[PDB]
Every structure is written in C-alpha cells, then in structure tokens.
Nucleic acid binder design. Sequence first.
RNA 1: ACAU
DNA 2: CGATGT
Length: 135
Amino acid sequence: EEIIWESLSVDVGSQGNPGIVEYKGVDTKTGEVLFEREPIPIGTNNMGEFLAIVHGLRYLKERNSRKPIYSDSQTAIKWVKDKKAKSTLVRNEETALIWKLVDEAEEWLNTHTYETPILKWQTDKWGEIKADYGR
RNA sequence: ACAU
DNA sequence: CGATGT
Ligand SMILES: [Cl-]
Ligand SMILES: [Cl-]
Ligand SMILES: [Cl-]
Ligand SMILES: [Mg+2]
Ligand SMILES: [Mg+2]
Ligand SMILES: [Rb+]
Ligand SMILES: [Rb+]
Ligand SMILES: [Rb+]
C-alpha cells in the first residue's frame, strides 16, 4: 500500500541474459548509491537479483541497521527466503564466477541470522525501483 | 498467469 | 523479438 521510504532498494543490471551482470543498492528515500558490485562476465538476471538482496542483508547487518530491503524480483525474494538459488544456468568454466558468488551467498545465509524484512517493490503502482539501471 |  | 524464473 505505502512505500516504506526508510529502506534499501536493490536491482540488477545486465548486458544480455545470460550476460554481463552487475547490481547496486540505493537509499530508497534519496537514491544515494550505497553499494555496487563489479560486473560479472556471465550470469543471469535472477542470480544478480539474488546476490543484490544477500549483499543488502550483509551490508545492513554490518551497520546494525534494521531497515527493510526492497526488490522487484519475485524469484530472488523467494530464493532468499528458501536460502537456495534455483538457477538453471549451466555450471561450467565461464559461469564459475557467478556460481561461486551464488554458492558463497547461500553459505552466508546458512550461517548467519537476520530480521531484515525483504519486501516486494510494487512496480505496477510505484514505477521503477529506485536502484534501477534505466537500461 | 505472475514477477523480472 | 530473446531469456530467466515461480
Ligand atoms: Cl555477490
Ligand atoms: Cl518492514
Ligand atoms: Cl515476492
Ligand atoms: Mg529488478
Ligand atoms: Mg531494473
Ligand atoms: Rb552486527
Ligand atoms: Rb533497466
Ligand atoms: Rb516466460
């Protein structure tokens, strides 16, 4: 119903899907960029959306912040809830980096606690998420 | 169908 | 138009 402005918003950007994947997190209220992942040569949209949420969890935990995280990705929200990224991307030499990051993200979720609410950004009502790449 |  | 996902 109402945007929770006191929050972190995350999003993926890609060149191809699968293709080059990056992600960032912004302060929902101001658009200030709070973190940005160096581009990963091959990944999927959903792997990037997942990594962005997990990085947000880690970022807020390190800072003792109870703010929620917004993502527009139904898939990634579910993967984080399950602590399992059910990607179809082939595991081979050229996808090794993205899969290492995804594996490490799951490992972190399995060994740490958090209360951060992970909320669906309602694009149809609110427009593009504030972390969007505009591409 | 919905979300990207 | 293609691809990633529930
Ligand atoms: Cl990552
Ligand atoms: Cl909340
Ligand atoms: Cl959701
Ligand atoms: Mg998105
Ligand atoms: Mg976007
Ligand atoms: Rb902490
Ligand atoms: Rb975009
Ligand atoms: Rb589809």
